[PDB]
Amino acid sequence: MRILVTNDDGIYSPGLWALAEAASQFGEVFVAAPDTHAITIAHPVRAYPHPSPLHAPHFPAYRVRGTPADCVALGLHLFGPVDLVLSGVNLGSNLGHEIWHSGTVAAAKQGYLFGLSAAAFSVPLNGEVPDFAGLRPWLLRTLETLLRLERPFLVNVNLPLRPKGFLWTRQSVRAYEGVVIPGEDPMGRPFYWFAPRPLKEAEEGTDRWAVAQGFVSATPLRLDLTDETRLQPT
Amino acid sequence: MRILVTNDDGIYSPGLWALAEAASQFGEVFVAAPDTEQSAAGHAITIAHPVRAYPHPSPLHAPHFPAYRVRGTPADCVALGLHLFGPVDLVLSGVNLGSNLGHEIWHSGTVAAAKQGYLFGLSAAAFSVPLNGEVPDFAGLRPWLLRTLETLLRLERPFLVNVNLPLRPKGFLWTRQSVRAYEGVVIPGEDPMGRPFYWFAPRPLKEAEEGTDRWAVAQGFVSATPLRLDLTDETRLQ
Amino acid sequence: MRILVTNDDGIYSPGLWALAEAASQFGEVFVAAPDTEQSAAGHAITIAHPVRAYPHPSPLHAPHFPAYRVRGTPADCVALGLHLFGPVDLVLSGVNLGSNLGHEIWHSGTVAAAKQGYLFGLSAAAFSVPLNGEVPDFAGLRPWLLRTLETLLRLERPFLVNVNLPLRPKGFLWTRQSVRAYEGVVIPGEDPMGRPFYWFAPRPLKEAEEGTDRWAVAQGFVSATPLRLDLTDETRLQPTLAH
Amino acid sequence: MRILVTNDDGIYSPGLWALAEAASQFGEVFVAAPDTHAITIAHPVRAYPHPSPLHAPHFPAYRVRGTPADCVALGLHLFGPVDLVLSGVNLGSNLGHEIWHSGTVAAAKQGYLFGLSAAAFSVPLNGEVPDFAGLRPWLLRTLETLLRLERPFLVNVNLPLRPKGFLWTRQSVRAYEGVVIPGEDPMGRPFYWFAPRPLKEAEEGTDRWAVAQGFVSATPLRLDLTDETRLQPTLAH
Ligand SMILES: [Mn+2]
Ligand SMILES: [Mn+2]
Ligand SMILES: [Mn+2]
Ligand SMILES: [Mn+2]
């Protein structure tokens, strides 16, 4: 099988090459990643061949001056056909409400919109730096699980820094309490700090709960934002 | 009731004041919208980072509205608005200059503001008008905006709804989001300087299904889609 | 004469339409301004990269003006405007919502548009009004915009002038750019999450001198500063070098 | 002497470390460069210690989440006292009309406004990648020359890939002709190409002419944009 790997952090992210190397154990890997979330149609996108270092395996790759979605569209053109799109590993979590604004997820979603199977991978920072040598086994195990899934699939994966297990999860959906704290800069000019916080703790079985417990979290995602329970409201 | 009106096109957009005016027919309106000149980046609330906002006079040829121009995101305007004008019962975002249908809902800044209000435990709605070429006439659309708001306010609260109004509506329907597969058209090119680039023109594969938002607007109908916050595909969870 | 009016605040700014209406008393006016919702960008003309621009209906409560909303920089608006509405004799940029005085001129997008017109061999002027405290009253400023424009149109061409109008003008003055030395005040701080950051509060070492743009506006006067394109320090082209 | 080195290309640019190493032969060097042009006051600025590139001398360094000017204000705070601000070496020329809005120049200018001496450095691109090892002798000769100037100074420097000389220069100031090429994308949607071009050849003595001749160009800059030939008296009574 052929796999396109991309991300949101850019072509120099260690997380990108960790995912690429892990994916190469399963098929031919090609990389298209941003130079620095929808497909760009307003203007054309530039892309440049990106070289592999002395110490690394070679992967045909391009640095793309576009969005993660642009990388997917372009990658499918420059390397097509592709069977799977992998986005990440993002340096930062993509849990619960965060999934909406995620460029990592946007790339995976784009692949799915194109009819392919896709997955996004992210790791929360929490003070220390991710050890991709230690995470590698978990990337491989997660990929084994994903690749046995009925196709096509769209899955959001978050791996804690030091995982102890794997759990299929649902997105955490909590209500938030708005918190605004007025302030003044050294020149006396007013400004505001926003500090919204969730109302309750993450429910057991959710993605946020899973990673806090030390488990890799995998959430299958839907494209349909329709709330079908309210199509014929009272 | 008390209504907060915001958008993602900016404090000077005619669509913003058109929505505010229509909303004033249903309650007290307060406005908080993004300021001019600030790189459009992200739809989340700006956290633990100072955000600037200033009182702003409402348009002369419009009713008076307390208002602030916010140097932040549409979600920031909602967070700030609930604070400056609390308590708020409803958050309306728009009317966006450009449609927000099907897969576009995911990345809409207009929708993000409404979603933020819903996350804060309030009812909310986003409004968008598809303007491809021809120009939107808010005076002509006022009756339909009023009728749409009337209908939304009959819903059980809280609700989260995405509304798209064609330029000249001839009906109203509740709709589901269109979900089509796309084709990733990429056409190589070269600029006048002889440099290589690519045109991306992704195209949907089939026509919009009957009953969807994209189908409804194509019919000339106002489309109202109730939205969910949960992106989990429960059919794939054991 | 044909006048191209643009700004950097966007096609919906009341300052843009106030400037277009004032200019219409002196010639044919055409508008080309930045569209809303744009990624941060510089002030140069976008080269070897296609730019989108669309016919735009001028506002209901403003006389009619042919117009285009351009998805590019203020300089792009000028380049596109000279093409769509050519020939153009004058480029007017503003009225900017916020002042552009002294050192601020270097980085003004409003000024960048006027300068682009001048680089193209045309006459140009940038217009700005101080903000932060209360927006401007363009109806009350109209007599001053007109007065200012009549003065500029008497100048030998081509010219490049930077104009700042106080909220309530009590006169007019040709001024020079205020050029003060600064102190780079940096004050450490921490956000509600305990993370560190720095407040940068640069401050001028002295009060603005009489005769400068900053001093004039503070006195209630409309300020007009003629600008040079050449940044060469002409007194150091043959510098004395130490032993 | 103490030197703050910054740029606008970011902390990863080889041009920045080339300037830092050359400058270290004249004094102690500290680096503050953008993470990705005036000082930011509307909000704060975040900055983080950053390692200098492996296989290169070590320099105290911070990557700043702000503008080139922010780096200067932050650098003066983190590494004060500072005697000289050097910005570059920018990958891309900063000649003639380009000076006005160059981020590289903006940093040097900020340093000058703060009362220090400052200089911006740039190298032209297209085709060949700058060879900083080969450029080092010319960077050193240029810095040695600037350090002989009466202070404070503000100079804009452009170095050809393979210099064969050095010249003080005037800023090129040519008029441009607008060129707009209408077009349509593959979907038949209209767009516009902009290709403005200078009207004549650069004059002798200017920065653009000097670099075209293979010489390092050094232009002293003036901060006062006032055109005194057009200043006027008031028409009062
Ligand atoms: Mn990321
Ligand atoms: Mn919008
Ligand atoms: Mn402005
Ligand atoms: Mn640069």
Curated annotation (Swiss-Prot), chain A:
Record's keyword terms, sorted: Cytoplasm, Hydrolase, Metal-binding, Nucleotide-binding, Plasmid
Family under the similarity heading: Belongs to the SurE nucleotidase family.
Keyword Transcription: no
Cofactor list: a divalent metal cation
Superkingdom to which the source organism belongs: Bacteria
Record flagged with keyword Nucleotide-binding: yes
Binding site residues for a divalent metal cation: D8, D9, N90
Cofactor-binding details, from the entry: Binds 1 divalent metal cation per subunit.
Subcellular location: Cytoplasm
Any GO molecular function: 5'-nucleotidase activity
Name this polypeptide is given: 5'-nucleotidase SurE
GO cellular component, one term: cytoplasm
Native source species: Thermus thermophilus (strain ATCC 27634 / DSM 579 / HB8)
NCBIfam families: surE
Pfam family of the protein (one): SurE
